[PDB]
């Protein structure tokens, strides 16, 4: 109750008041205290003019933002702070890359709202685990594929359909249908398997050049931008990349532990006895992260610095790899850990 009251009655604080570099690619949104993030969401929506443009009801918007925050659990990585940082990067793309030259206003709004909702109710486990553990989610969606992503979308729609939380309530039937369809496309694009399936079409688009009159190019660009937001922790400094690795592997190893208890053999990356982090992170950066930001650079010249910072963080991992081998004796002057 109290949180809602202040969010609604204190006024939407100016975006620059959050941080002086808030609109910069150098800013790390994970440094913002979690208690300040809901107001930051409002401040960003205001600064992008979405509240005014779509005449979003402020009481409704405040309830929506809090309910979305409440719909994330607390696994090490896939929590509200992930969603906030992803949404923040969407804002950064709006501020720095002139998205208004490529996408419709409603598409940009949909991207931002999708970022907020894209990992709703994540349980710290991937799609394979849902099928293997015969979860309720796999019962619902395994035959369609993208189990978790369909669940994230359905949670987002359930929030909208909660009384007092439909921020699109006044939209026309056409614009409402448009928004929900965009959210579906964008949230489902956060599945790695989807990204892999469209990756050649993304390269084709970047080769022939973006045609803003081509409806397929809008769709493809939206998928690329969404994945860029989802992986945006890799575009910051080394320390952020190091911390997120810690969170990512804590989550993965928990799943791997669960899988061993069910009698299944986990992936190397989820097996704490077998996983070599530097090599795995290098691989993720080279095969997944870097190509996404290279395509981004190919489409937006001003995105160059993002690819550059990811490539540098990739080299930082190679530089620090030797630190994973124990030289000399450990701090305690003992070799007891061998027994």
Residues near ligand Q2T, by CB under 6 A: 126, 190, 192, 195, 227, 230-231, 244-245, 248, 269, 284
Residue 217 counted as an annotated binding residue: no
Q: Which does 249 bind (CB under 5 to 8 A by kind): Zn ion, ligand Q2T, Mg ion, none?
A: none
User: Residue 78 to residues 71, 229, 232: CA-CA distances in angstroms?
Assistant: 12, 14, 14
Q: Residues 179-208 vs Mg ion: string with x where CB under 5 A? A: -----------x------------------
Residue 111 or 206: which CB sits closer to Mg ion? Answer: 111
78 is a catalytic site residue: yes
Q: Exactly one of 230, 251, 259, 298 binds Zn ion (CB under 5 A); which one?
A: 230
- DSSP result, 220-288: HHHHHHHHHHHTGGGGS-HHHHHHHHHHHHHHHHHHHHHHHHTT----GGG-TTT--HHHHHHHHIIII
Residues 6+ apart with CB under 8 A from 140: 147, 150, 151
Residue 58 or 267: which CB sits closer to ligand Q2T? Answer: 267
State the minimum distance, in angstroms, from the CB of residue 230 to ligand Q2T. 4
Stretch touching Mg ion by CB under 5 A, among 114-122, 172-180, 265-273, 305-313: 114-122
State the minimum distance, in angstroms, from the CB of residue 190 to ligand Q2T. 5
Sign of CA dihedral 147, 153, 156, 160: negative
Length of the chain: 339
Q: How far apart are CA 27 and CA 88, in angstroms?
A: 10
Residue 45 or 295: which CB sits closer to ligand Q2T? Answer: 295
Residue 151 counted as an annotated binding residue: no
Residues 6+ apart with CB under 8 A from 77: 124, 244, 247, 248, 250, 251
Residue 82 counted as an annotated binding residue: yes
Catalytic residue ranges: 78
User: Which residues does the annotation place in the binding site for Zn(2+)?
Assistant: 82, 118-119, 230
């Amino acid at each position: 109750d109290d949180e809602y009251t202040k969010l609604l009655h204190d006024g939407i604080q100016p975006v620059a008041a959050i941080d002086s570099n808030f609109a910069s690619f150098t800013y790390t949104p994970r440094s913002l205290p979690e208690d300040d993030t809901s107001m930051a969401i409002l401040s960003m929506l205001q600064d992008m003019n979405f509240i005014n443009n779509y005449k979003i009801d402020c009481p409704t918007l405040a309830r929506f933002c809090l309910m979305v925050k409440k719909g994330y659990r607390d696994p090490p990585y896939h929590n509200w702070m992930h969603a906030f940082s992803v949404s923040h990067f969407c804002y950064l793309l709006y501020k720095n890359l002139e998205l208004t030259n490529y996408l419709e206003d409603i598409e940009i709004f949909a991207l931002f709202i999708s970022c907020m909702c894209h990992d709703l109710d994540h349980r710290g486990t991937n799609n394979s685990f849902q099928v293997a553990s015969k979860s309720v989610l796999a019962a619902l969606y395994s035959s369609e594929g993208s189990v978790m992503e369909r669940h994230h979308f359905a949670q987002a729609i359930a929030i909208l359909n909660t009384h007092g939380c439909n921020i699109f309530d006044h939209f026309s039937r056409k614009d409402y249908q448009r928004m929900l369809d965009l959210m579906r496309d964008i949230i489902l694009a956060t599945d790695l398997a989807h990204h892999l399936r469209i990756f050649k079409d993304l390269q084709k688009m970047a080769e022939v050049g973006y045609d803003r009159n081509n409806k397929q190019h809008h769709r493809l660009l939206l998928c690329l931008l969404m994945t860029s937001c989802d992986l945006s922790d890799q575009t910051k400094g080394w320390k952020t990349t190091r911390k997120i690795a810690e969170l990512i592997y804590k989550e993965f190893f928990s799943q791997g532990d669960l899988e061993k208890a069910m009698g299944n053999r986990p992936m190397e990356m989820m097996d704490r006895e077998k996983a070599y982090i530097p090599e795995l992170q290098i691989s993720f950066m080279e095969h997944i992260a870097m190509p996404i930001y290279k395509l981004l650079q190919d489409l937006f010249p001003k995105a160059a610095e993002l690819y550059e910072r990811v490539a540098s963080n990739r080299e930082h991992w190679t530089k620090v790899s030797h630190k994973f081998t124990i030289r000399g004796l450990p701090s305690n002057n003992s070799l007891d850990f061998l027994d």
